[PDB]
Design a protein around this ligand. Structure first.
Ligand code: HEM
Ligand code: HEM
Ligand SMILES: C[C@H](O)[C@H](O)C1CNc2nc(N)[nH]c(=O)c2N1
Ligand SMILES: C[C@H](O)[C@H](O)C1CNc2nc(N)[nH]c(=O)c2N1
Ligand SMILES: O=[N+]([O-])c1ccc2[nH]ncc2c1
Ligand SMILES: O=[N+]([O-])c1ccc2[nH]ncc2c1
Lengths: 413, 413
């Protein structure tokens, strides 16, 4: 009938009934095929599209206090008719809005989901060129940033039609720092963007060889070739790292962008696929303080902050790492707060997520959750999420990963 | 053919071929049925036992630089013969030793597995009464403790025969503190052992109503009723909590036992089942410092250590929790080191585990690993394990969970 879910912290039990609406032991795999919706060079077969489309129209019209049956039946008919005559179909703006929030709502890996209903939708389905994409993206960045008072938003570009005319942002995130393979063996900047940085150069981009060089938007429109565009510096808002007690922190010359905007995911809804639909929320402290600054495959500033703290950076047992990373986290939080830039610490985030789950189970009996992703990279068992058993499952609408565009792209020049 | 496993930190790739030898989306479930080997009231059907038995005899004799074929064939024959005439079969001491290390080696949830080959085996298969079990357990505790220089060991009691004559320790761990439902609503001691503490009282145990009262061994022998036994205090070694800078720490009057000995798991090997086989290794700092002392469902001393540190325990964003728990961890490590009691910090543990995995893949191409359990309850991404993708799968031999004995036990009085 259902599935019991226990919360070892409060002892509370829950019954998951929502997992029955899923699709189809790979433990900690980052990019599992089950979470990816790749390319296709032929339209969505009508026998597949029509059913998925109806289900979505039923979901949409099925959600409202005062349900209007007429409009529902009518939409069902007009949609089927549209599919018959055109092949694919066009969602109403209202439906799209609903789609994007639901897809987010159904994001197993997102901790910010309590905010799900609070999203801004930019309808760029009329878009047709790279330069027009670049303008919509700029519009996005400017609206989302709001001078530090960050706002969650998403820009939806034209849906995949036949598959050969795909709209795709080649970037992983909208704002992202560059990383270069320095002469003296060392890596400079964000070592994670090394491979993509090279690509930008190959497409003719002037590399400013620095630690915090904002990378260029690499836009692909209507299947065409990717065109490079430098993001207007005035648009990219950054925070300078500063510790509230360690005056030597600023001397580290650190900073990070305030806009966490996922750029390369595909939105699937009612059988339709939107290969380009960048979105953003606001940062959660640990993202910058722990992953960005502390991963060895990133800025790796941990040993650096260690010695300047006086810690025994040569004795693991001294727990100097637990000491440094915490102070780094404090810097991030302090710096965003001082410069009036939205941000939420992980504890607070975890609590709101728990409240979210409770709301989700009451409202629909379930909440697709990925424990491996929801538990913060620090203070694991200190956050309530660690103690909550949770079910992971792909629903619909949903945000899928895509095959890195530079692999499956037939060049023209 | 195989399965690619990537380590996002070093970028290294690995090929898992060992997962093919497994048995048979439930994400973060603590006690999944797949990890439990419950009761049975009939012997292991010969058609099932014979094949499993052979596989094990092939595994055993298949592991050695200089393989002796004769002994192998002979053992195969004698084993089958024994199964024909008696039903079940008896493992040689050498085989049992090999079984216990392999079962440990195959423990997805254990981080200490680099130590796998370094285990002491106490053969108590001749045991027949509760009082004899109690003596073997005492012998175990005394050998494992070694006056602080902890030694990994396991005591194997008689295998399950028909299922109605099960040897079972009713305790979760050998040494474990009691927890009572105090008059004034509050809970005293280890809130996790509340239900079991009540049981001990019901079986006639004198409750000393304290924060650190070592619970009694509740032993069940040859299917008989569970008899209670108080662990000789001289045997139970404890460490007094003491911070190296905060002289007010000792004032908290904290302490914890030095012996982490899992008592209620079942050992499965070559079709045979050993329902009682307590084992132990040595503590990993975070276990006591984070889970035992900091979980809200345990001693919950976090807010307590917070205020005495001066921290803003009323503002989550101040990261006071990240500050306290770290100092608590420091206390634990410092206290065990000072009192000459073995212990390993989590960073060091993680590193050794990584070395283990590398050894496992080279030696047998795989290492069953549970990421959710291997990643420390603090400093997640700071440890290398967080970045390692890993496959979870039940092999054989293996240590299974059992249904809590007090549920499926037909009382006699
Ligand atoms: C308003 C604040 C929000 C917060 C605090 C939040 C936080 C997070 C965090 C911390 C992660 C993990 C990121 C990583 O480790 O790479 C994440 C992932 C994700 N979030 Fe949210 N989020 C927010 C808004 C949004 C919105 C508006 C959407 C979509 C419309 C969304 C969709 C997702 C998706 C799909 C992922 C997965 C990305 C991946 O798998 O790499 N988030 N979020
Ligand atoms: C020598 C030092 C050892 C260390 C540092 C170590 C550490 C750990 C840790 C930290 C856990 C997680 C405990 C929890 O959160 O409940 C664990 C679990 C486990 N360990 Fe080890 N271990 C050691 C030796 C052993 C030995 C000797 C065996 C078996 C012969 C073993 C078998 C297991 C099993 C089966 C579990 C799972 C228990 C459960 O699922 O609740 N460990 N170990
Ligand atoms: C709900 C969640 O699975 C549970 O609280 C966990 C997770 N990981 C764990 N990790 C370890 N080592 N030990 C545990 O008790 C748990 N419990
Ligand atoms: C190997 C492991 O799955 C990987 O490093 C993880 C795990 N959990 C994560 N959690 C979040 N939120 N983000 C991540 O990048 C990862 N990566
Ligand atoms: O996906 N997102 O928009 C998103 C939102 C908030 C975030 N904090 N840290 C990473 C991150 C990503
Ligand atoms: O299972 N064990 O023997 C075992 C060994 C070491 C440990 N550290 N923390 C818990 C724990 C359990």
């Amino acid at each position: 009938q259902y599935v019991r879910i226990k919360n070892w912290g409060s002892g509370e039990i829950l019954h998951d009934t929502l997992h029955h609406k899923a699709t189809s032991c790979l433990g900690s795999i980052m990019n599992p095929k089950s979470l990816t919706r790749g390319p296709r060079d032929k339209p969505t077969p009508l026998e597949e599209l029509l059913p998925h489309a109806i289900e979505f129209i039923n979901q949409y019209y099925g959600s409202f206090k005062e349900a209007k049956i007429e409009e529902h039946l009518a939409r069902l008919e007009a949609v089927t008719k549209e599919i018959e005559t055109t092949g694919t179909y066009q969602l109403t703006l209202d439906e799209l809005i609903f789609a994007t929030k639901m897809a987010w709502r159904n994001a197993p890996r997102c901790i910010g989901r309590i905010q799900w209903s609070n999203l801004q939708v930019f309808d760029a389905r009329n878009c047709s060129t790279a330069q027009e994409m670049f303008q919509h993206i700029c519009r996005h960045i400017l609206y989302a940033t709001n001078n530090g008072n960050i706002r969650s938003a998403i820009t939806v570009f034209p849906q995949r039609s036949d598959g050969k005319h795909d709209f795709r942002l080649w970037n992983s995130q909208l704002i992202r720092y560059a990383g270069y393979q320095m002469p003296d063996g060392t890596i400079r900047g964000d070592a994670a963007t090394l491979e993509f940085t090279q690509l930008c150069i190959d497409l003719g981009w002037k590399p400013r060889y620095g630690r915090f060089d904002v990378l260029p938007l690499v836009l692909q429109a209507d299947g065409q070739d990717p065109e490079v565009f430098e993001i207007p510096p005035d648009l990219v808002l950054e925070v300078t790292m500063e510790h509230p007690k360690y005056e030597w922190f600023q001397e580290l010359g650190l900073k990070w962008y305030a806009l966490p905007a996922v750029a390369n995911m595909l939105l699937e809804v009612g059988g339709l696929e939107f290969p380009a639909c960048p979105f953003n929320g606001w940062y959660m402290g640990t993202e910058i303080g722990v992953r960005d600054f502390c991963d060895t495959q990133r800025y790796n500033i941990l040993e650096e902050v260690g010695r300047r703290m006086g810690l025994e950076t040569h004795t693991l047992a001294s727990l100097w790492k637990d000491r440094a990373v915490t102070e780094i986290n404090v810097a991030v939080l302090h710096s965003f707060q001082k410069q009036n830039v939205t941000i939420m610490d992980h504890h607070t985030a975890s609590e709101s997520f728990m409240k979210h789950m409770q709301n989700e189970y009451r409202a629909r009996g379930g909440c697709p959750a990925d424990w491996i992703w929801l538990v913060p990279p620090v203070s694991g068992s200190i956050t309530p999420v660690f103690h909550q058993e949770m079910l992971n499952y792909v629903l619909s609408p949903f945000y899928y990963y895509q095959i890195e565009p530079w692999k499956t792209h037939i060049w023209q020049n």
